[PDB]
Amino acid sequence: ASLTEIEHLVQSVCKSYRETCQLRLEDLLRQRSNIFSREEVTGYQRKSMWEMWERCAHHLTEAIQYVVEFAKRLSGFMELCQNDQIVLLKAGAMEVVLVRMCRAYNADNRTVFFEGKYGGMELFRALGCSELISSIFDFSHSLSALHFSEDEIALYTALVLINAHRPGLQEKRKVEQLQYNLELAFHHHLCKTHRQSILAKLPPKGKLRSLCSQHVERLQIFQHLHPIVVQAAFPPLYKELFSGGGEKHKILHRLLQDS
Ligand SMILES: CC(C)=CCN(C(=O)N(C)[C@H]1CC[C@H](c2ccncc2)CC1)c1cccc(NC(=O)c2ccccc2)c1
Ligand code: NA
């Protein structure tokens, strides 16, 4: 691959991200003064654990749906076999969501945009997973200190997804080739924009892995307490990704075959 091709991959990735970023950055920035009042915070804290879990699962499912479309438009992704497309999304869709989330996080007051306004960690106290919430806020706080541009988020989240080390890949060498090209595009862009200083400050892969593992652990705790809530009121795509034995849902298969 030559230089003009690396730059074409840079613009192709940024275009696929812009078309699938879910929320406009300007919309998120303009709403920073719109913060939940103490009464609205109390209202969220008074909601039942199962209602807050349901609402968060819905917002999570919607964010994952945009990540799936990002993948479908990502150069090289649809060339991979369907098994590998599903392996990469099952392991990586949530990690992409957690990175994208830093756009909706305000490090000045430690709040995140949620259901129309900004609120702190205390907004989510009814979930009963305070340790995971604090880890998510800490992760978004760490990414916010980097002051990512939109192009940087695009190239970085493409690499989060195209990981040739995910277990279960059948065409590992093909994913390796795509990952190498996307790394070149990412690094070429950082070199051109004099932003290579962020490479040492990107979080280690173990941080994203720990966040996703905590998600599975806290979901199993909740599913034990409210199994009918999960079965009847959680979205099917959410259950295919995090719950078990819920992998029986074909949702990802159908989202990839549409368009
Ligand atoms: C703090 C909190 C809970 C926030 C609620 N929530 C949420 O706001 N999401 C999905 C945002 C994800 C980012 C998305 C975005 C932002 C900016 N630009 C583009 C896209 C907006 C929606 C969220 C976010 C990350 C993870 C979770 N986790 C769960 O629901 C869960 C917890 C335990 C077990 C299983 C699942 C929930
Ligand atoms: Na931010």
Swiss-Prot record:
Consequence the record notes for mutating residue 133 to N: Nearly abolishes transcriptional activity
**Coiled coil ranges:** none
Q: Where in the cell is it found?
A: Nucleus
Q: Which domain of life is it from?
A: Eukaryota
Q: What induces it?
A: Up-regulated in the state of obesity.
**Tissue expression from the record:** Isoform 1 is widely expressed in many tissues, including liver and adipose, and highly expressed in skeletal muscle. Isoform 2 is primarily expressed in immature thymocytes.
Which residue range or ranges hold the NR LBD domain? 5-243
Q: Which disease?
A: Immunodeficiency 42: An autosomal recessive primary immunodeficiency characterized by increased susceptibility to concomitant candidiasis and mycobacteriosis. Candidiasis is characterized by persistent and/or recurrent infections of the skin, nails and mucous membranes caused by organisms of the genus Candida. Mycobacteriosis is characterized by infections caused by moderately virulent mycobacterial species, such as Bacillus Calmette-Guerin (BCG) vaccine, environmental non-tuberculous mycobacteria, and by the more virulent Mycobacterium tuberculosis.
Q: Regarding domains, what does the record say?
A: The AF-2 (activation function-2) motif is required for recruiting coregulators containing LXXLL motifs such as NCOA1 and NCOA2.
Q: How does it assemble?
A: Interacts (via AF-2 motif) with the coactivator NCOA2 (via LXXLL motif). Interacts with the corepressor NCOR1. Interacts with CRY1. Interacts (via AF-2 motif) with the coactivators NCOA1 and PPARGC1A (via LXXLL motif). Interacts (via AF-2 motif) with PROX1. Interacts with FOXP3. Interacts with NR0B2.
**What does the protein in this record do?**
Nuclear receptor that binds DNA as a monomer to ROR response elements (RORE) containing a single core motif half-site 5'-AGGTCA-3' preceded by a short A-T-rich sequence. Key regulator of cellular differentiation, immunity, peripheral circadian rhythm as well as lipid, steroid, xenobiotics and glucose metabolism. Considered to have intrinsic transcriptional activity, have some natural ligands like oxysterols that act as agonists (25-hydroxycholesterol) or inverse agonists (7-oxygenated sterols), enhancing or repressing the transcriptional activity, respectively.
**The protein, known as:** Nuclear receptor ROR-gamma
Q: Which residues of the full protein are shown?
A: 265 to 507 of 518
